[PDB]
Design an enzyme around this catalytic site. Sequence first.
Site, PDB file in Angstrom:
ATOM      1  N   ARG A 290     -73.855 -27.267  93.723  1.00 29.26           N
ATOM      2  CA  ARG A 290     -73.720 -26.591  92.436  1.00 29.26           C
ATOM      3  C   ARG A 290     -73.752 -27.580  91.280  1.00 29.26           C
ATOM      4  NH1 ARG A 290     -69.195 -22.083  90.347  1.00 29.26           N
ATOM      5  NH2 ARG A 290     -70.170 -21.809  88.294  1.00 29.26           N
TER       6      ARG A 290
ATOM      7  N   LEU B  62     -67.551 -14.921  83.680  1.00 27.69           N
ATOM      8  CA  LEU B  62     -67.797 -16.017  84.603  1.00 27.69           C
ATOM      9  C   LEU B  62     -69.179 -16.612  84.366  1.00 27.69           C
ATOM     10  CD1 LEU B  62     -66.445 -14.403  87.900  1.00 27.69           C
ATOM     11  CD2 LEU B  62     -65.180 -15.371  85.969  1.00 27.69           C
ATOM     12  N   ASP B  63     -69.451 -17.706  85.070  1.00 28.80           N
ATOM     13  CA  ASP B  63     -70.790 -18.268  85.082  1.00 28.80           C
ATOM     14  C   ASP B  63     -71.725 -17.371  85.887  1.00 28.80           C
ATOM     15  OD1 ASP B  63     -70.087 -20.488  83.537  1.00 28.80           O
ATOM     16  OD2 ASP B  63     -69.517 -21.666  85.299  1.00 28.80           O
ATOM     17  N   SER B  64     -73.023 -17.501  85.614  1.00 34.32           N
ATOM     18  CA  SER B  64     -74.005 -16.706  86.345  1.00 34.32           C
ATOM     19  C   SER B  64     -74.047 -17.097  87.816  1.00 34.32           C
ATOM     20  CB  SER B  64     -75.386 -16.866  85.711  1.00 34.32           C
ATOM     21  OG  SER B  64     -75.463 -16.191  84.468  1.00 34.32           O
TER      22      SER B  64
ATOM     23  N   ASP C 101     -71.648 -18.456  89.889  1.00 40.19           N
ATOM     24  CA  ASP C 101     -70.499 -18.190  90.748  1.00 40.19           C
ATOM     25  C   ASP C 101     -70.466 -16.754  91.256  1.00 40.19           C
ATOM     26  OD1 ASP C 101     -68.345 -18.265  87.821  1.00 40.19           O
ATOM     27  OD2 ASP C 101     -69.376 -16.549  88.700  1.00 40.19           O
TER      28      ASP C 101
END
Lengths: 109, 51, 615, 27, 247, 47, 70, 76, 84, 66
Positions: free
Chosen positions: A43, I40-42, I44
């Site tokens: 990530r 949230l982030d895209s 996660d």
Amino acid sequence: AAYFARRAAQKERVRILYRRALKDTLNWAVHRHIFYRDASDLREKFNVNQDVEDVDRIDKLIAHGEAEYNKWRHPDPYIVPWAPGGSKFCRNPTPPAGIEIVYNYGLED
Amino acid sequence: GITYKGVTVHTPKTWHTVTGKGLCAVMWFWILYRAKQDGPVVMGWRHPWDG
Amino acid sequence: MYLLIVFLPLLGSSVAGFFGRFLGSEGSAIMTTTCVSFSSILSLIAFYEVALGASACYLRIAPWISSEMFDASWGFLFDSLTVVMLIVVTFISSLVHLYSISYMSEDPHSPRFMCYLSIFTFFMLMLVTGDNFLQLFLGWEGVGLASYLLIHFWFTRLQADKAAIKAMLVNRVGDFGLALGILGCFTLFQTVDFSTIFACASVPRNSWIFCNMRLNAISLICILLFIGAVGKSAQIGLHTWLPDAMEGPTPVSALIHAATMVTAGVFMIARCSPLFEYSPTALIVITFAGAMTSFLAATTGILQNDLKRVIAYSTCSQLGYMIFACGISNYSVSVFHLMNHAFFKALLFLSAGSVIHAMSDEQDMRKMGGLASSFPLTYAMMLIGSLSLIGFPFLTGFYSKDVILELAYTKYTISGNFAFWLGSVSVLFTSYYSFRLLFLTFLVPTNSFGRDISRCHDAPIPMAIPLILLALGSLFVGYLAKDMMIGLGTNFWANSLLVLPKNEILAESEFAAPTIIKLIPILFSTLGAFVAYNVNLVADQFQRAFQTSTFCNRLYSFFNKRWFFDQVLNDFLVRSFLRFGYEVSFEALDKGAIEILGPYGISYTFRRLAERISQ
Amino acid sequence: RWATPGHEERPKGYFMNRTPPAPGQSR
Amino acid sequence: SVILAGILLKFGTYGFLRFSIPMFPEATLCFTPFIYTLSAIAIIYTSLTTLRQIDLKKIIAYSSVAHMNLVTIGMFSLNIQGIGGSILLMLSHGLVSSALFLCVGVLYDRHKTRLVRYYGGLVSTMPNFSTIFFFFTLANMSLPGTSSFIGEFLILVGAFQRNSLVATLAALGMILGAAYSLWLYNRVVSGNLKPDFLHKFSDLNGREVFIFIPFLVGLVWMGVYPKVFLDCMHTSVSNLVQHGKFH
Amino acid sequence: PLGTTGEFFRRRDEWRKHPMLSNQMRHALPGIGIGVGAFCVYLVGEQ
Amino acid sequence: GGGMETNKNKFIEDWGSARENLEHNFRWTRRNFALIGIFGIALPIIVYKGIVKDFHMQDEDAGRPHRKFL
Amino acid sequence: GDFRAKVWSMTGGPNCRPKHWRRNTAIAMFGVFLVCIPIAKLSAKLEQRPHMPVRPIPSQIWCKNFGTKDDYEKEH
Amino acid sequence: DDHLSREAVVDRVLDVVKSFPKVDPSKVTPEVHFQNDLGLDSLDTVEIVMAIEEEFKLEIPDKEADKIDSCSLAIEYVYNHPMS
Amino acid sequence: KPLSVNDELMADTVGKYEALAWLSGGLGFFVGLGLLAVLNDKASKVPFTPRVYPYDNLRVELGGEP
Ligand SMILES: CCCCCCCCCCCCCCCCCC(=O)O[C@@H](COC(=O)CCCCCCCCCCCCCCC)COP(=O)(O)OCC[N+](C)(C)C
Ligand SMILES: CCCCCCCCCCCC(=O)SCCNC(=O)CCNC(=O)[C@H](O)C(C)(C)COP(=O)(O)O
């Protein structure tokens, strides 16, 4: 249309690539204790490239990412046994519906 | 059956544990007993009676 | 009493398959299990009577084929070699039948599975108790048919059908080789019976004209027979069918491919020893093929993650060991290792199937771990099987593999050195992947899912009695039978096996070599176990090399994908023949070329000719 | 499992796919 | 089709046995390599073309050309194993092949189609047909215990004694014969059902069960004890082997 | 245990520390103690 | 749907008809000429030479002169 | 399913379990026993043992062809 | 051998989404949107979907794996699937 | 969607020729090991003389002339 489709389609291709890369990373690192750092670094590969905003440079990055994944991919991935391509798939499937059997088919007169 | 976080592990019956331990102990005792008898022979320290 | 040994499985199959609708899923199991068990006890009396009593029995029912001199009657030959195969095959078949009673407890079509198992056992008994080359061929091809039927027992799957058809094609090439060998046998001695051929196997010293070549008559026959042995035993030439044949049920793997039908080639070589002994050229080929097969299977089996597939390469390596043990012209040790392996490999398959069945049919070692506490019995049983397989000292696998290795050392010839080297490295590789299988499945921290652990149940009684019997076998049978089979000057085999006085090196195998050679397998096994532990249980997991080194990734793919056999062989033979079927034979030879010069392609000019008659 | 009587009173499907004749009659 | 394949294909071989192999013993020897060449390539070509056929009756019809060309290898070998073993193959072929066309006729009468694509999964709806179809599949692929193997093997041992090369080429016939014979059975019988194409089924009736019975009995009876047929021919086929020979 | 992805997955595997599953090397050799004890009893008793 | 007859598909039926009506599909190109002149004119000659030479070598081994196979 | 209960098969079908499989099982044993008797009687008649056993073996109770082929010079 | 009830599915899915470091477990309703209610982030979202996948032992085909962007859709997908 | 004409016969990280090269290297490993075994010449390093049997190497008992 480009601002809603030509850019957003890449925002879905990147999700697909992240999913496939994560599954492959879990496949390579057999033990769960080791998968954590590998996934974190994976990530971190994506999280560093979030600074881009112009399509002129992101698209080739996605192409290179797909090229890289396609060659470090696991030769023998893990498949759920009842999932398609698994070992238990189509073992004892539910018989199709609507099929009927007739009696006394060939009888004279 | 013991639950840690939702998941539970069914404790094996006494028959399985006893049988497994007994078979493993028999294997170990047999290996040591054989090592006592002809252990020197395979090591080459002593022939059976050849010399 | 000896016809009952062969025909009880046939009667059980004929009852459970023709009248299974009246017996159900329980009566059909009882019939086959009882019939095979009675055949097993009858084989036990047969062992007490023929092998130990030293009185072989020869039984001829009726003539089958009676040409001018092509006589291949319905004869059964029970000698020392045959009885060992009987007490192995039938005992393993009865244990597999008992195992499948609990294994096939929820599968709908259990009676047909047991009918197939019984018919397979019947065909194997006809194979081993064969007096002629044709009854032997009858069993040799019926066993292939039964394996094909059992591999796609789940006909709905597509991979099962592909594996079954591939197995049939490979076994068909093997059968072609065996048929050519049998044809060669009749052309020389004008008989197919074993007694006459083995009696007259020394006189012929002539040369034939075979396929525009002048070869030796005996050597050509022996090579052709070894081709069939390669086809059935999954040797270097034709082995890709065996790893793919794991799509069948686990009891199919344990009996059809572990104990029996892979030892068919070894048994045929050992039985035809009074003929293979007079063709020294064939023995070199046998030794080379066995060594290559053992090393190749050992190298391929170290990177597989499927639980069942790892064991298949172990079986391939053991069969290679038996093959080049036959190649050193020591058939007693080959049969001894055959009987030894038929115990601790059937045990391995049965324990692996017990793990898989309890784990909701999960076959990947990457998704199991920490099962030692949950599965005490099966963990102990797989420990016993693995320790026997690697050749732990003073165990069933120690009394045969070590003898084979030291015999290969003392065969002071070019072929013997190659076999010794490959069999020495294969010991290290076998230890490595056996201990990796043991570690990943049982001792590593848990990598499975919550649902698999929640639904766990150890082996019940019907799946535990065969396991325990196989464990006792893999503990004591090797030691018990060490003296009678591979002893010095033993008369147990009587006339079953012939070893010429010139090529007899059994005595020098024991006291002619340094003690280091007798300890090489143990040292290599310890090294492999240490490597497996250090790479699996505790390691930094440097797999990042597999993600940064292009060569490492391709090297990993090479061992994983069966040395690139299935991919290369498919594209260059199967696809080529499929194109050869349509694009030429159907597309050009008989499509329109005959038509255009035939009756209507250009012969229809009579329409342009009869109409002109008005002139 | 090994003591309970079965549920299928008669084998599923007619033999040769022919319905049994009238009661007290013959094929 | 039963008449055309069962008998009409046996005129050529019978004509060779009765009017060619004896009236010209010298001419037969000269043309023996010619017949071996034609029969060897016919076995290879036809058993290979069979793999790429899509019609049910056009696949079995190509299984007869390979079998009937294996017979002409046996007749021209001019020995007891060859000539005597070639007769059993035609009797076996006359029963195995004609029984296969009955199996196809069973499928065609119910569902008016012959393409293999439409057929699949019949093992779950027509089990008696699948059992009977599989048995004749085994006979067509020269399995021991069947009448085809006795004729097939006796021809091979009759030609190996004369020419090892032609017996080698003809031996690949059973390699390819076992390929399409089981591969057809896997497509038609095994697999999943296709309710989109066809959904109504009916297994074998009383006639079909009874019709196949003499074929089942007459195929294993010749396959396990062919001595009944063989002993009735050796006096007649041995006088056929030598006619111009007097030593 | 490092990074937002590793922390999440590590936190999800808190059930893997179940007592019946945590340590298995202690059960790596099932009956070594009983076998060694019986062999020692046999060895001492012979003399 | 009270009929056992198959629900034939246009694509499958047309594909089968095309695969069965291949008689009129030659263009007499070099590929077809080379293919029929090699795998239909040379392989039979090679095989015939093989059997003839096998008979000749069988004849010479026994010492008998070659048989006139023509 | 619903239609597989209308298909007749010799093996019995999926999850076959007749109400009287106990009685049928007992009959099948007795039938197998009855057909195994002539096979055993046939085997004891056509079997040949050229060598006398080292110790008294159970096959000497019924088999009688022990040490009969020792004069192989007059075999047919 | 019985498929778990919907509320049993709700318990496990909500536990999975609750046991996340970036999210705030203060208010996690079954009807929430990952990119609109939790912020949230895209990326996660993919991790949460995966963790749901092995938590129920089911393989979602990659095509509609990313279609799961709300807790409501995830529960419905893992419920209407029969083999789970 | 008309069906293909060859609609009766239907390791992705490698090509047929590249995998054939890998197989050729793997088998050349065996060939080179065999050549090394030949070069070792273990026949000339046997530590014992060939075994000699009585009664002229058991000629009579092995089927020789009486
Ligand atoms: C000829 C010499 C070699 C003989 C080998 C015999 C090997 C067996 C050959 C036939 C096996 C059957 C394969 C074809 C049928 C495929 C399966 C099938 O449908 O058969 C039926 C019928 O059952 C049978 O398989 C009977 C055939 C085998 C039993 C008879 C064999 C008797 C012993 C073999 C011959 C004896 C002599 C062998 C030595 C010469 C079973 O159906 P089910 O299991 O209930 O599941 C199907 C689903 N549904 C019910 C919905 C339709
Ligand atoms: C087997 C091999 C394993 C994998 C190896 C590595 C494979 C990939 C290597 C290359 C990866 C990259 O750097 S390229 C992949 C990412 N590249 C970028 O430039 C990210 C820019 N940001 C965005 O696209 C959006 O913001 C978005 C991310 C959708 C967030 O959605 P939101 O707008 O809501 O925030």
